[PDB]
Design a protein around this nucleic acid. Structure first.
Lengths: 311, 310
DNA sequence: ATACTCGAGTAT
DNA sequence: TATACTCGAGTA
């Protein structure tokens, strides 16, 4: 009856299975290896460039490698934002005095090894963002397939076009269209619906993963649904990012209610553990959350998407 | 209102750019200190791996198999979900996809890959170190508060996991905070015990800071429960506060159910404007009992003096 | 800006 | 030991 009751019969219907977790970790590793090559090649290139220095101090004169030297000195690009030029030069001198000179004849590999060791945290950062985008793509693929299977045309917004205004008609074969869709728009029963991802919602003044608008492809009454989408596969992060999402959804509910609005709210997650599953179920029963789906379970995702399209 | 002793406005909670810059510099210093064992393991891996004349030969050096798996793109966290065959397969992919194609440079290909992936491991280690150091800073503030007030205390060594050997404060407790899992004292007849990272029975969740009405379950023995965030990254400020807020809500919810109203606190090193407004609102409404910005000594001292007198 | 992406470790 | 803690590497 209730939307979620179509694909959820018990609390643990929401729980991610052991096989789904192993599959996710394997796919994450495959993508990590695919993404790794440019990092190793940049390290190979750095060694070629740095190798013209005959002494660690000589590295200070190869302007082409100074950013790499700052990185190898233990400064992430996130940290670099907070350092003055002096701090940066000092960090590089520390690398030269504390590690490169002491490595003596092995100073070039000392540099390359440190540059890779710290760049590994950068690749890790990149991979966490990649996992997020792939999750969004998976949900979009489920949404457009649901429209396609129902013979409902739609328009889409290309994430590459930052004016984010040119709504294009669905191509004949929308194979992999989800790779670049920032939003999807359709009409069902006369009503126009526009789904957008990662939008700043003015009433809460916070970004929201999923937003469904009552409007042909800001005005609080136009928000039909707001939802959080967690594509992480790590069970150790399941409750962590659910605690985060729950405050996000409460900020939403609080601000909208103040205005007399009750938009629908949803939570979709690939890593769902027992405790958090109990809380999601309680919220669905109490009406505080409108629907939910475990992203690794096709039938749930499909049911939720068909429901979304008909809202 | 306890918090009014050290907070006059919402922005008194906000971290300054100078404290952020100082935090980032201190994190980098610690990272460089912790980096050496990683590079040395890479040097040692190269020495051991060098015996192989071909990438396939690496499969026979039993001593490097774990490093091979790691270099193949498998974090220790992911490793837990892999079967032995998954692992074998991962290592073969490394051999076929990267080491054979590197030809003559195959050993460095392996070492470079081992380090690149191990960098995420060092990042993991550093995030946990940052947390521990934040806990130590708060403990230092608490023991100094007791010392300056001439109040003895006993302490629990985090070093042996038994967590039962409560010891008398030493004459000089210099750096005692480095290994204290808990601190216990008596003030005006009341016995108080502070413990860190305890699983709290009623919520069935871990809590950063617990104050017990008990000399060194029983949900009613809980005087205070608090969240402590030692992160210095402003980009993680709202993120970890959103998390903390659900943790504190679960606490309030489960305890009220039982007719209990333990005090609650939030201490954070990275506090931004938006979350500062929400913390301020909760302090004003009585939902949150006290708060302090960990980078501001006067706030931390005022909060710790208040904690000791609860 | 401002606050999003999520898993690298860790502990009880 | 099942469970959930640590926090910043990126990103927009």
């Amino acid at each position: 009856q209730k939307p979620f009751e179509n694909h959820l019969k018990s609390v643990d219907d929401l729980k991610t299975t052991y096989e789904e977790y192993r599959a996710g970790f394997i796919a994450f590793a495959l993508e990590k290896n695919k993404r790794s090559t440019p990092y190793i090649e940049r390290a190979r290139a750095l060694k070629v460039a740095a190798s013209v220095a005959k002494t660690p101090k000589d590295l200070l004169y190869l302007e082409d490698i100074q950013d790499a030297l700052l990185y190898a000195s233990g400064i992430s690009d996130k940290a670099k934002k907070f350092l003055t030029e002096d701090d940066k030069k000092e960090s590089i001198n520390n690398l030269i005095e504390n590690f490169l000179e002491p490595a003596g004849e092995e100073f070039i590999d000392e540099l390359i090894f440190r540059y890779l060791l710290f760049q590994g945290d950068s690749l890790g950062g990149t991979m966490r963002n990649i996992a997020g985008a792939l999750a969004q793509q998976k949900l979009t693929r489920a949404i457009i397939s649901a429209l396609d299977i129902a013979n409902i045309p739609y328009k889409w917004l290309d994430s590459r076009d930052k004016k984010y205004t040119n709504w294009m008609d669905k191509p004949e074969d929308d194979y992999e269209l989800e790779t670049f869709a920032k939003g999807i728009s359709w009409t069902i029963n006369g009503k126009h619906r526009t789904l957008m991802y990662n939008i700043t919602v003015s009433l809460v003044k916070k970004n929201v993963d999923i937003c469904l608008f009552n409007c042909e492809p800001q005005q609080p009454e136009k928000y039909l649904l707001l939802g959080e989408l967690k594509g992480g596969i790590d069970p150790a992060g399941a409750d962590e990012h659910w605690k985060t999402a729950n405050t996000a959804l409460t900020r939403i509910r609080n601000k909208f209610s103040e205005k007399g609005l009750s938009p629908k709210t949803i939570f979709i997650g690939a890593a769902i553990e027992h405790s958090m599953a109990e809380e999601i179920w309680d919220q669905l029963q109490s009406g505080s959350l409108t629907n939910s789906a475990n992203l690794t379970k096709t039938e749930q995702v499909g049911s939720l998407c068909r429901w979304i399209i008909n809202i």
